[PDB]
Amino acid sequence: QTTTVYSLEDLLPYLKQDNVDVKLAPGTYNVNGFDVGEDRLFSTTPLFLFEGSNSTYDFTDVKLNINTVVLTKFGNNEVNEIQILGNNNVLKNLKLEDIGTTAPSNRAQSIVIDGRDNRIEGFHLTIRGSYPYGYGDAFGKGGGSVINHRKHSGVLIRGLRNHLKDCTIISRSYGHIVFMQAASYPTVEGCYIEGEMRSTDDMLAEEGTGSPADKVDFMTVWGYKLPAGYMMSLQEGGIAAYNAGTTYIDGVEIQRATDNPTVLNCTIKNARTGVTLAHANGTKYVEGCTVLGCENGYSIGSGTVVNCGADAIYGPVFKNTYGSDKGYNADITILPPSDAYYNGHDAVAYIGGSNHNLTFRSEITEIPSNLKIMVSGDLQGLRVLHGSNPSQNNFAGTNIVLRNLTNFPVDLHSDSSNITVTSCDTDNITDNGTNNSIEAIDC
């Protein structure tokens, strides 16, 4: 029943059909600029548009090389390499690599998952080609940028009950690695997700070169000159959910927030955030995850983070996003450093909002003097200085259980109230709050 094809040309008609079982034969397939045009292999974008439903596509031992010049061959329009519009499809085992670093004319996504009940499993994706590449989001990630951007993100999960499973996603592009827009019940499971980092000090060393950042005197979109002493991802979110998107399911165009996301047994390295789901609605659940060398570890707003780890070399392992955060329950291990420390945020965690139950565990004995668990206060976060992003900083925390099974110090700010703290040591706890309880635990 499986049909095997031996070229991209013979693959494309099956994408339009329902209930097919198709295999693209092992080999290397190249997509170049000359493959785009009216009489060419790819006359439209998305390049591979999966419109059928109830189909299975096997890409075992397939290497698909897409030249990044293709991101410029469709005018000033978004280019998606793969988009799934149908339902109940399974795509497996493709190795997809962007060749070169040519930026999109507008913007690009490697994979977009619409429809419902689709699964992409076992893919190996390498994302390349974006502008500007080397500043993270310092000079703009949305409208009103200081340096105008041509972003290129990895996997965009939308639709309903769509599933990214056992994939490796490597990004060397300015964009999210895995993100969700208008996705209901998305699941990310068993994935390895990886960006790369650059220090703000290395960016500031562009002074006098005539670089794009040098020409704006390093004035960030946050309203201040780029501060020294931070490590930034060149990517955006590793696994990030946003509240405003459009998706299509069964011909219906839907504009909604992401809801009910689940993230299981993923490892996320060198992204702006490990897992951020604060903007998603419904039930948020994160379990078994490992976050290494990200600017922020876990920020889900409300829900459960359990049996998860993060190191603190570049930023806090935990952050409450807003003072509106309620019901965030977490059990997070602060992992040994994956690399040298370079944490300009002066915090291992920033806690606020209300009715949280937070446990931190760690075997670390070598504690950098600037790292502390903060409950309320003025976070020295890269994007929240000098009143920038004001709702994400300087807010109160009330009625929170904090179980500090670590050697990290704790600072309870004046805006903290009714914090129930238990800690291995109470001598390194500063309490300036109201009606807080501090009790010692024996290891």
Residue numbers in the entry: 1 to 443
Study text:
We first measured the enzymatic activity of 12 mutants and found that eight of them (D137A, K141A, H176A, F179A, E236A, R240A, Y242A, and Y242F) almost completely abolished their activities, H279A mutant retained approximately 65% of the activity compared with WT, while mutations of Asn243, Arg272, and Tyr322 to Ala only negligibly affect their activities. Two positively charged residues Lys141 and Arg240 have their side chains pointing closely to the C-5 atom at the +1 subsite, hence are potential candidates for a catalytic base. In contrast, the R240A mutant exhibits visible structural changes around the active site. Specifically, the Try242 residue was rotated approx. 90 degrees, and shifted toward Ala240. As it constitutes the catalytic acid, the hydroxyl group of the Tyr242 side chain is essential for the enzymatic activity, and its improper positioning may severely affect the catalysis of the enzyme. These structures suggested that the loss of activity of the R240A mutant may be due to the shift of the Tyr242 side chain. Based on our structural and docking models, several positively charged residues such as Arg240, His176, and Lys141, located near the +1 subsite, potentially serve as neutralizers in FdlA-NTD, weakening the negative charge of the C-5 carboxyl group at +1 subsite, and making the C-5 proton susceptible to the attack by a Brønsted base. Next, the positively charged residues including Arg240 and His176, which are located near the +1 subsite, neutralize the C-5 carboxyl group of D-GlcUA at +1 subsite, thus reducing the pKa of the C-5 proton, making it more susceptible to the attack by a base.
